[PDB]
């Protein structure tokens, strides 16, 4: 008696029942459900990664990181359902706390008060401080990756693209939230740019750099920030795109007050420091929390840190999907009876 949703088997029962379609996502359908054992509502992500190495990669990383992470502002994994043998496992079901919506969905329907904008921003940075303490880069931060409640509680999700920060060493529908140096040159700075981009989107209810492709993305960023001062040029390592930037016509910086005319001055000032073109000059997570825009919520004693760094020394993109399937089977074993 496996339960069906939109002609798709969701085999989560008898524990989880009353399935309701939420949305589609990478490789899988998400549903709200009732957990009959704990008498609580949950979200359940059905994942069918096993035909694609890349999908397997994102699933393992996600499971590993979310299980290691414990924070108020980061979504957790409550339970994971899968077949009792590896040959029988064609799907993995990830059970999480049910959140009412995500920031992307909210911004379609609703304009945000500068109050809610400020508080949302604080939670993003508070979650990110923890992430960066574990020396992990999220690398995918965007509004759909930010889960929300009507009680204004925010949680960061979707760690599938996350990895340990190293200086130095695959899509992704949107380049909109990706740092300029990613197009050019990894580092904690790239998550800050993303957060800068999300803040801008809460302000105007539109993406600040909605580029249609690689170079168009650059032209968007440059249309706002203007052409780099140098010192930005010449802090660039790859010399092929430095000269590309030199070969570009001049662009004027658009002052953050002309855009976002209705925005807090303190917000715009912080926006400026997240959105700096040079990664080295870009504001760090703990400095951002300490910015006057967040003074209302800033409390470093209540802003918890990771106990140690997170460890991925394991092989990243190279592993065969059969092996990854073995690893996913092992990682999810703690949720199985007899473990």
């Amino acid at each position: 008696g496996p339960e069906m949703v939109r002609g798709q088997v969701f085999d989560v029962g008898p524990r989880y029942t009353n399935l309701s379609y939420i949305g589609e996502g990478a490789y899988g359908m998400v549903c709200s459900a009732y957990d009959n054992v704990n008498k609580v509502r949950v979200a359940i992500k059905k994942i069918s990664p096993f035909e694609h190495q890349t999908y397997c990669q994102r699933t393992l990383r996600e499971i590993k990181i979310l299980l290691a992470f414990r924070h108020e502002n980061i979504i957790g994994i409550n339970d994971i359902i899968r077949a009792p043998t590896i040959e029988q496992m064609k799907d993995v079901y990830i059970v999480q706390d049910l959140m009412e919506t995500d920031l992307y969905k909210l911004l379609k329907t609703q304009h945000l008060s500068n109050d809610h904008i400020c508080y949302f921003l604080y939670q993003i940075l508070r979650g990110l401080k923890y992430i960066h303490s574990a020396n992990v880069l999220h690398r995918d931060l965007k509004p759909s990756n930010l889960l929300l409640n009507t009680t204004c509680d925010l949680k960061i999700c979707d760690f599938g693209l996350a990895r340990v920060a190293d200086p130095d060493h695959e899509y992704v529908a949107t380049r909109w939230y990706r740092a300029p140096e990613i197009m050019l040159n990894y580092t904690k700075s790239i998550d800050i740019w993303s957060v800068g981009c999300i803040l801008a989107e809460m302000l105007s209810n539109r993406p600040i750099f909605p580029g249609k492709h690689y170079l168009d993305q650059l032209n968007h960023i440059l249309g706002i920030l203007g052409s780099p001062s140098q010192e930005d040029l010449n802090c660039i390592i790859n010399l092929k795109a430095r000269n590309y930037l030199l070969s570009l016509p001049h662009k004027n910086k658009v002052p953050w007050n002309r855009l976002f005319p209705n925005a807090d001055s303190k917000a715009l000032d912080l926006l400026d420091k997240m959105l700096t073109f040079n990664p080295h000059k870009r504001i760090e997570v703990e400095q951002a929390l300490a910015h006057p825009y967040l003074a209302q919520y800033y409390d470093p004693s209540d802003e918890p840190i990771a106990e140690a760094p997170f460890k991925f020394d394991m092989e990243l993109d190279d592993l065969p999907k059969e092996k990854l399937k073995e690893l996913i089977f092992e990682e999810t074993a703690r949720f199985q009876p007899g473990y």
């Binding site: 508080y119 009507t150 204004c152």
Partner: peptide, 17 residues
């Protein structure tokens, strides 16, 4: 959905104190 006051959030309640 529609957003409740910020004070509905528990973390925000720890801020008001």
């Amino acid at each position: 959905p529609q957003l409740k006051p910020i004070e509905s959030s528990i973390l925000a309640q720890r801020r008001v104190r």
